[PDB]
Ligand binder design. Structure first.
Ligand SMILES: OC1CCN(Cc2ccc(Oc3ccc(-c4ccn[nH]4)cn3)cn2)CC1
Ligand SMILES: [Yb+3]
Ligand SMILES: [Yb+3]
Ligand SMILES: [Yb+3]
Ligand SMILES: [Zn+2]
Length: 607
């Protein structure tokens, strides 16, 4: 039933375990290894199973200790290639057989990003990291690349003795390689069933420091110190999150601070989450991105989406818990401010992509469409917009959180669709069905544009941001002298970012307005990756030539697509930077991430 896959569905075949024995050769830029898939049959007399590949070369397929005949079909863009494996002898229902595939990756694989020592914040050692979400585990190893299949895994990775190898699992051992003395083999065990898109590897000159009874923060020697401070609230957040979903059954929770290159704020990888170094502002304000990945240990890591059309079930429900952690740490005044900010981001994505556009619906049709392209603010904020509306109809926070605690409990270790969620939303609230029936279902789930109902948000914290935003938009030439550093003497870092976000929706503003802002507030001096981003966009949209060097620099400074893609598109629209925007892309294309370079290129109209 999964459009984004070329393999046999869960109804025909199901993978139960995976044993990965590989080596990381940085000279060759490949992942030399053998994958042992303890595959189970769900049909009587199964003669052949199909698997997902992309940029792979197979040496041999070993079943029962013998070479078997395998066939690889014709390549289909982002989906990759189907790998039909002819079985030696037919399978019965629930009959488990191991398949050892001797794969070989590509140095230009869409999942892995190979780093030159110069690209790292160590300058003396190389770095390697993956990103299997959504359809990129096929670019690492041949498997049933579908979130309709949850599997366990045990792994052994051979890397040089001078490096540290880490996976999305709990570590077991540490011993040197037998037929390579300059190498060390690291063991990883994942007893908890997890889909292939959540499997991740990271190798490099890493170092760890404890920040609580179950957390380890991983980054290079000269990045550990501020990593310990910025995410020091993780232990307290986890204790709060447990009273929202249930027990934390993963053993250890770790944070891994990636090099700038990483294209996402955070990735929900179990036992070892993936975070961007841009989160480090030094004040602990970007801590909500940690609250999002903690919340993912319940939604996405326990209750996973069966197909990618139902992705909103992951992020949307996670944004609810993320704001609830912040709404138990900083109050309901903050939870409502963030929820109001969410609609704001949603408005920006709906106006950009288009109102009647297909990728603005909550359940979209990913037939002949790449999920990495269709990624926007719709499954995050529109998915939350639904939940917050339901909450303000069925009761309140305590009542709706009670539904989610039962929801995680009901579909734990399982892969579900939007149809499965709506049944439980009607089964849990079996007495408040009258309220549930008032809700237009086709308008929130299958219709494009803004949702038909805008919920009620507490404007207590948000009003100040709007007051200062409206002050600038309404201001004339003579009015600009009224603005002083006094203006933001009470506005917080989140409120300063909200003011910039509100102004950017009404951008471009006169060039004199922008110039004045820097003369009194000094927005260039700030090191907050969220504040700096919107401010740079505001100048480039308003045609400020002084901002061109800074705007280009921020896009090369980091790899997060939340900030790089807007910048490179902004400078492409702006006449005095259109050439530089293109020139920087092609000169930095080699150093870029295979996902970052792919999406930026299309937005710049470059092949
Ligand atoms: O923190 C996370 C951030 C995102 N991933 C990468 C990623 C990209 C796309 C994706 O698949 C999608 C996205 C949106 C929709 C959709 C449905 C209705 N509208 N839009 C459907 N499928 C899944 N993962 C990395 C870690
Ligand atoms: Yb052990
Ligand atoms: Yb039902
Ligand atoms: Yb005036
Ligand atoms: Zn997420």
């Amino acid at each position: 039933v999964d459009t984004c896959s070329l393999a046999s569905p869960a109804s025909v075949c199901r993978t139960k375990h995976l044993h990965l024995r590989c080596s990381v050769d940085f000279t060759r830029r490949t992942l030399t290894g053998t994958a042992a898939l303890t595959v189970q049959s769900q049909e009587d007399n199964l003669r052949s199973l199909v698997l997902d590949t992309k940029d792979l070369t197979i040496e041999k397929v070993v079943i029962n200790g013998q070479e078997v005949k395998y066939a690889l079909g014709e390549r289909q863009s982002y989906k990759g290639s189907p790998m039909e494996i002819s079985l030696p002898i037919a399978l019965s229902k629930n009959q488990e057989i191991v398949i050892e595939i001797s794969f070989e990756t590509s140095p230009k694989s869409s999942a892995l990003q190979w780093l030159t020592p110069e690209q790292t914040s160590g300058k003396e050692h190389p770095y390697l990291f993956s990103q299997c979400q959504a359809i990129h585990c096929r670019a690492i190893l041949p498997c049933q690349d579908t979130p309709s299949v949850k599997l366990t895994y045990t792994a052994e990775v051979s890397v040089p003795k001078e490096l540290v190898a880490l996976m999305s699992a709990i570590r077991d051992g540490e011993t040197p390689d037998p037929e390579d003395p300059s190498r060390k083999i690291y063991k990883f065990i994942q007893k908890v069933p997890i889909p292939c898109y959540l499997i991740a590897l990271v190798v490099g000159a890493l170092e760890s420091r404890q920040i609580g009874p179950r957390t380890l923060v991983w980054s290079e020697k000269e990045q550990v110190e501020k990593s310990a401070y910025e995410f020091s609230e993780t232990e307290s957040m986890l204790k709060i999150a447990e009273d929202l979903g249930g027990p934390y059954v993963w053993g250890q929770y770790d944070l891994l601070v990636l090099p700038p290159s990483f294209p996402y704020g955070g990735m929900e990888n179990p036992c070892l989450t993936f975070v961007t170094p841009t989160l480090l502002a030094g004040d602990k304000s970007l801590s909500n991105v940690i609250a999002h990945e903690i919340s993912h240990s319940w939604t996405g890591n326990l209750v996973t989406n069966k197909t990618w059309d139902h992705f909103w079930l992951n992020e949307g429900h996670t944004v609810y818990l993320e704001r609830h952690i912040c709404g138990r740490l900083f109050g309901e005044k903050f939870r409502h401010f963030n929820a109001l900010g969410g609609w704001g981001e949603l408005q920006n994505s709906v106006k950009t992509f288009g109102e009647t556009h297909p990728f603005t619906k909550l359940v979209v049709d990913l037939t002949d469409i790449d999920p990495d392209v269709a990624y926007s603010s719709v499954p995050y904020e529109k998915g939350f917009a639904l939940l917050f509306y339901l909450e303000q109809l069925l009761g309140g926070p305590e009542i709706f959180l009670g539904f989610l605690k039962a929801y995680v409990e009901k579909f734990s270790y399982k892969s579900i669709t939007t149809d499965d969620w709506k049944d439980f939303l009607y089964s849990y609230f079996k007495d408040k069905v009258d309220v549930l029936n008032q809700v237009d279902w086709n308008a929130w789930l299958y219709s494009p544009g803004l949702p038909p109902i805008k919920p009620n948000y507490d404007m207590t914290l948000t009003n100040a941001c709007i007051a200062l935003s409206q002050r600038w938009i309404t201001a004339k030439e003579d009015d600009l002298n009224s603005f002083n550093a006094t203006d933001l003497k009470d506005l917080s870092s989140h409120q300063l970012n909200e003011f910039l976000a509100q102004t950017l929706q009404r951008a471009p503003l006169p060039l004199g307005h922008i110039k004045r802002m820097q003369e009194v507030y000094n927005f260039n001096a700030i090191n907050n990756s969220e504040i700096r981003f919107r401010w740079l966009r505001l100048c480039i949209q308003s045609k400020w030539e002084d901002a061109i060097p800074l705007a280009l620099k921020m896009a090369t400074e980091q790899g997060r697509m939340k900030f790089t893609r807007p910048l490179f598109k902004d400078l492409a629209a702006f006449d005095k930077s259109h050439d530089q925007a293109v020139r920087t892309y092609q000169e930095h294309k080699a150093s870029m991430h295979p996902v970052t370079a792919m999406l930026v290129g299309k937005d710049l109209k470059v092949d």
